[PDB]
């Protein structure tokens, strides 16, 4: 019987130690690679949408510097006349776009605030945006919850759909809060 760590004993102790500390998993059980941002089960390549070593998600179309026609670039010409970005005067479609596309960014939070102003509430558990339907009042109204037919936004089909919900006020989110973290960098916490 091997009386060192090169035997089965060292292996089991490594297993227990890795079960204890997450910063020691590199030698024992290893980490789940499928939990990472990239999709290992894809027929096509994934390198053209590879952002950074610390990115938890692939590149967005608004992150790829594509070679557009010279006619399209107009920012240099209309840098004085083009309207400023005001979230208040946008359609709910554009708001949903700015919400879903700008994940992990302040723009998602701002869009969430505007939607909150349009009487939309975000269900934490259902992971969708829900609002009141025209002419539709809740069947039961209690101090803790209310149920009935409401309007939620399907992001899969990109269309407003009606569905019966059992909305609890605890499951709903109040007004979104804006962070004050100076020089925040997500890649710093990719450990």
């Amino acid at each position: 019987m091997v009386t060192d760590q090169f035997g089965m004993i060292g292996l089991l102790t490594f297993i227990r130690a890795a079960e204890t500390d997450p910063g020691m998993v590199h030698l024992a059980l290893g980490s789940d690679l499928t939990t990472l941002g990239l999709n290992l089960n894809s027929p096509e390549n994934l390198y053209p949408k590879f952002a950074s070593p610390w990115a938890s998600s692939p590149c967005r179309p608004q992150d790829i510097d594509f070679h557009v026609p010279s006619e399209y670039l107009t920012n240099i010409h209309i840098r004085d006349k083009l309207a400023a970005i005001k979230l208040g005067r946008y359609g709910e479609d554009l708001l949903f776009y700015l919400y879903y596309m700008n994940g992990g960014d302040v723009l998602q939070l701002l869009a969430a605030v505007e939607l909150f102003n349009r009487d939309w509430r975000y269900h934490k558990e259902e992971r969708v945006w829900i609002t009141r339907a025209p002419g539709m009042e809740p069947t039961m109204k209690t101090n803790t919850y209310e149920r009935g037919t409401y309007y939620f936004f399907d992001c899969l089909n990109w269309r407003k759909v009606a569905k019966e919900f059992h909305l609890e006020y605890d499951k709903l989110e109040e007004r979104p809060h804006l962070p004050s973290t100076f020089n925040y960098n997500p890649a710093q916490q990719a450990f």
Binding site: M1, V2, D4, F6, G7, M8, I9, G10, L11, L12, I15, G23, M24, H26, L27, A28, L29, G30, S31, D32, L33, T34, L36, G37, L38, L40, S42, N45, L46, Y47, P48, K49, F50, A51, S52, P53, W54, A55, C59, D65, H67, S70, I76, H77, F182, N183, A187, Q188, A190, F191
Partner: protein, 512 residues
């Protein structure tokens, strides 16, 4: 004494003016006019008179951009209430301007066919920026920041990878220049620049240009070398038990880029596995699993779950793998001489003990065994054995690999080494258990035979330790490894379950 007087003022004026022009209302034609005018004034100021003054100019501009970045960061730290976006926008402003200037200078250097001048200017500027980086790193140390150099390098890279003919004709030399640049800026040479450095390697367009767009796979060796540099830097910290958060993030990033390379360019990791394994510490199972799981696209691996025989892969067993790493050169001339002599004459038998004395060169603290020499020994002896068996007139089987000078080495190293030595040895063997080929088969039979005809139970415990360890971790798992381990369980000709180490701990017994 450094520069002639008044030169810094010329450089400052010119750089600032170009910054003004670059962000000015200027399209393509306007950029051509502004560029011609700026080059004109640049000539007039007596800067392009000699290569020396040019070097001084580029260096001064670089240093100015750097100091601007430092001022921006200091301004941000002193006034945290200030918008970080604008603080970054200043650095972006000046750096993008300078980069555009450099690119435009490289493109219009000499005639159209004059590629030599353009490339020379490229290596010139790159070398200058590198020098400035090294000096700044050496003088600031902990105060060193990567933003200016990072942005300069990546933006210049993007600029020189533009879809135009002139840049296309010199693309390979450009990639070469950037590769040499990235090699000089090794993390072991420039630690504080590590993160950005990784982002310079794992960047999508760089990977695309190096491993995909470059024909005849000529970019593979350089990128492989860069990866070897990364692995070299990571090695001493990964060998340690505890891992700090910076190292953890760097490691996660390495896992991501390696995953990308595995999914997109498996042939690359396949062809250069030996060097990577020769650099990566034996206790790092995930990395070696990422590298050993690499196999050609056209190959369809047989089901390891329910194997019928070795007749499904019989056409691929006779196919020898490709090793693009000179491992025979690692061995000392005399040692290799004696090795071949014994592999030819099987005499004397003292060569075994002398060999064991020759692979544990104890002259430096910390390391007790020459790992690379061990790997080289295993691989060389194995390949030589396969060649000998084939030249004999038969194929390497369970009974054909036995009773030879080649096997004597394996047996001796198995029984006459300590736990550490045999650990590194068995790892060296298990590193060849990959996709169906001659090597994985020969070394599978070798591993299993070493288990069977083992003197003590300790050796068997070690083999099982390795084969299990490389399978307890998460995916991916090498094919030949899994097969070799399956053979220990399925075939009753080993009496695996009769051993004590299987019945050692309740967790272990319940694991099987």
């Amino acid at each position: 004494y450094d520069d002639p007087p008044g030169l810094r003022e010329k450089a400052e004026y010119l750089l600032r003016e170009w910054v003004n022009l670059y962000h000015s209302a200027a399209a393509g034609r306007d950029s051509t006019k502004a560029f011609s005018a700026f080059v004109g004034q640049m000539h007039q100021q007596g800067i392009l008179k000699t290569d020396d003054l040019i070097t001084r100019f580029f260096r001064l501009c670089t240093e100015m951009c750097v100091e601007i970045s430092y001022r921006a960061q200091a301004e941000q730290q002193h006034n945290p209430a200030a918008n970080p976006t604008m603080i970054r926008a200043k650095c972006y402003h000046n750096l993008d301007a300078f980069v555009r200037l450099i690119a435009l200078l490289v493109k219009h250097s000499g005639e159209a066919t004059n590629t030599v001048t353009k490339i020379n200017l490229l290596n010139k500027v790159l070398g200058i920026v590198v020098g400035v980086l090294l000096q700044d790193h050496d003088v600031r140390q902990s105060e060193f920041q990567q933003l200016p150099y990072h942005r300069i390098f990546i933006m210049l890279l993007l600029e020189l990878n533009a879809p135009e003919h002139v840049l296309e004709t010199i693309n390979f030399q450009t990639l070469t220049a950037f590769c040499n640049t990235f090699h000089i800026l090794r993390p072991t040479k420039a630690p504080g620049f590590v993160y950005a450095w990784l982002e310079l390697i794992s960047h999508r367009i760089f990977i695309a240009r190096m491993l995909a767009h470059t024909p005849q796979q000529k970019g593979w060796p350089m990128y492989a070398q860069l990866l070897i540099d990364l692995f070299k830097y990571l090695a001493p910290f990964l060998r340690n038990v505890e891992l700090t958060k910076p190292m953890q993030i760097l490691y996660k990033g390495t896992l991501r880029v390696l995953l990308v390379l595995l999914h997109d360019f498996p042939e690359f990791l396949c062809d250069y596995h030996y060097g990577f394994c020769d650099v990566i510490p034996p206790n790092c199972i995930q990395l070696r699993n990422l590298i050993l799981s690499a196999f050609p696209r056209n190959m369809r691996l047989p089901d390891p779950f329910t194997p019928n025989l070795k007749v499904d892969m019989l056409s691929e067993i006779n196919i020898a793998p490709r090793i693009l790493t000179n491992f025979t050169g690692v061995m000392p001339p005399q040692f290799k001489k004696d090795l071949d002599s014994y592999l030819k004459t099987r005499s004397p038998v003292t060569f075994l003990s002398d060999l064991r004395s020759n692979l544990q060169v104890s002259n430096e603290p910390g390391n007790r065994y020459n790992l690379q020499l061990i790997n080289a020994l295993v691989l060389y002896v194995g390949t030589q054995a396969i060649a000998h068996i084939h030249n004999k007139g038969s194929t390497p089987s369970m009974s054909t690999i036995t009773h030879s000078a080649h096997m004597d080495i394996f047996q001796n190293l198995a029984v006459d080494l300590d736990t550490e030595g045999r650990y590194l040895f068995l790892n060296a063997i298990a590193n060849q258990l990959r996709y169906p080929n001659s090597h994985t088969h020969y070394f599978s039979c070798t591993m299993l035979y070493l288990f069977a005809e083992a003197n003590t139970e300790a050796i068997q415990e070690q083999i099982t330790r390795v084969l299990l360890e490389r399978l307890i971790v998460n995916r991916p798992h090498p094919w030949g490894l899994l097969i070799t381990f399956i053979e220990l369980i399925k075939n009753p000709a080993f009496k695996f379950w009769n051993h004590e180490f299987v019945h050692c701990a309740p967790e272990i017994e319940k694991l099987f």
